[PDB]
């Protein structure tokens, strides 16, 4: 009923804000994480619609809130415009990136209480919420979004920070790479609007090959893998091996000049930083989450690559539900609506006494 018994859940993405009501199966609002201010304020879709008279900024970079004034504008927009709520009437769960600095989570806490007067709030790690969305408290999550990719091992509900891996290769970088390789094929994409066209191409037509070399050979042997795509002006372009070369970058970051191992190897590295006693549990519970895990074929590719890295007899399971583009939000919706979670919120009374640093003893 969206009343005082209902918590709010806001997932603060580098690319998209997902927001809604705890207990709902899907976010009520999904909008671009941008703020527009006069050239020479508006948020989200309205900011984009008025782009001709505004200059636009992303307040969240690689999963970390970096522009606080613009973030307050995003949160105000989220509550008042998108959800149509009074934040003083609802416990509010915010998400944070893995390894979010102490000062950052303190500031999130401060703003919720001092600006928005929430009665209660909590900050949860995005990857932990994705695990919870699958009904698990132990496993290793690969969360790949628009701005950052993380491998997060979690045992009994606790992320294990020493074993967390961060890779600053995610969806936006994949779009940029697709622009580059389409350009190679003859089709020029370079501007901000063109980057949005290519993001759409990526989401609609890209996929992950099970065997990259074999797929390259298939693409060379006939036009069977080619797809046509119509641009806004009516021009129709062809996409071929670019369909799978783009997300291949996740497995081979050298495609964009990065020295990092690919996401299968970072998954392995993260597991190996954890005690051997929980190893079987991690391998048997590999959860994929985030928009950049939506590529057809990626779960099968990860199953194959993890199998190649793991001991021969290890039981491997890749969990990648159809709803995984929103599983951070969905996990937050589940958690914030559990009766046994209600004792876990930081209350406004607790905040009044302890200040922002209370977040470190309440939220982990």
């Amino acid at each position: 009923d969206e009343d005082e018994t209902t918590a709010l859940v806001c997932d603060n993405g580098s690319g998209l804000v997902k927001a809604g009501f705890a207990g709902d199966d899907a976010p009520r609002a999904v909008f671009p994480s941008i703020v527009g201010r006069p050239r020479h304020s508006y948020v989200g879709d309205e900011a984009q619609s008025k782009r001709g008279i505004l200059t636009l900024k992303y307040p969240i970079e690689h999963g970390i809130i970096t522009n606080w004034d613009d973030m307050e504008k995003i949160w105000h927009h989220t509550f008042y415009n998108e959800l149509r709520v009074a934040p003083e009437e609802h416990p509010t769960l915010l998400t944070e990136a893995p390894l979010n600095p102490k000062a950052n989570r303190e500031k999130m806490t401060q703003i919720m209480f001092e600006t928005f007067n929430v009665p209660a709030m909590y900050v949860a790690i995005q990857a932990v919420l994705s695990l919870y969305a699958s009904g698990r408290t132990t496993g290793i999550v690969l969360d790949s979004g628009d701005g950052v990719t993380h491998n997060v091992p979690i045992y009994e509900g606790y992320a294990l920070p020493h074993a967390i891996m961060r890779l600053d290769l995610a969806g936006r970088d994949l779009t940029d790479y697709l622009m580059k390789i389409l350009t190679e094929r003859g089709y020029s994409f370079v501007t901000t609007a063109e980057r949005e066209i290519v993001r759409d191409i990526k989401e609609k037509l890209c996929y992950v090959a099970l065997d990259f070399e074999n797929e390259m050979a298939t693409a060379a042997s006939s036009s069977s893998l080619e797809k046509s795509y119509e641009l806004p002006d009516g021009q129709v372009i062809t996409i071929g091996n670019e369909r799978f070369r783009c997300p291949e970058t996740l497995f081979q970051p050298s495609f964009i000049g990065m020295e990092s191992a690919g996401i299968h190897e970072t998954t392995y590295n993260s597991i190996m930083k954890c005690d051997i006693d929980i190893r079987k549990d991690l391998y048997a519970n590999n959860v994929m989450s985030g928009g950049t895990t939506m590529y057809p074929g990626i779960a099968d590719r990860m199953q194959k690559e993890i199998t190649a890295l793991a001991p021969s007899t290890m039981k491997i399971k890749i969990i990648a539900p159809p709803e995984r583009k929103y599983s951070v939000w969905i996990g937050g919706s589940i958690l914030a609506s559990l009766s046994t979670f209600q004792q876990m919120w930081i209350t406004k009374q607790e905040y009044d006494e302890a200040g922002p640093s209370i977040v470190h003893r309440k939220c982990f």
């Binding site: 009904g135 698990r136 408290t137 045992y155 509900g157 589940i334 958690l335 559990l338 046994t340």
Partner: peptide, 30 residues
Amino acid sequence: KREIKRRLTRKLSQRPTVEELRERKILIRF
């Protein structure tokens, strides 16, 4: 659709302490 909530509730209620996880070298602060 709500089996997940039952499962999570039970698992969270049965979790070991942070102290136990540190003693088992699962959580490693330093």
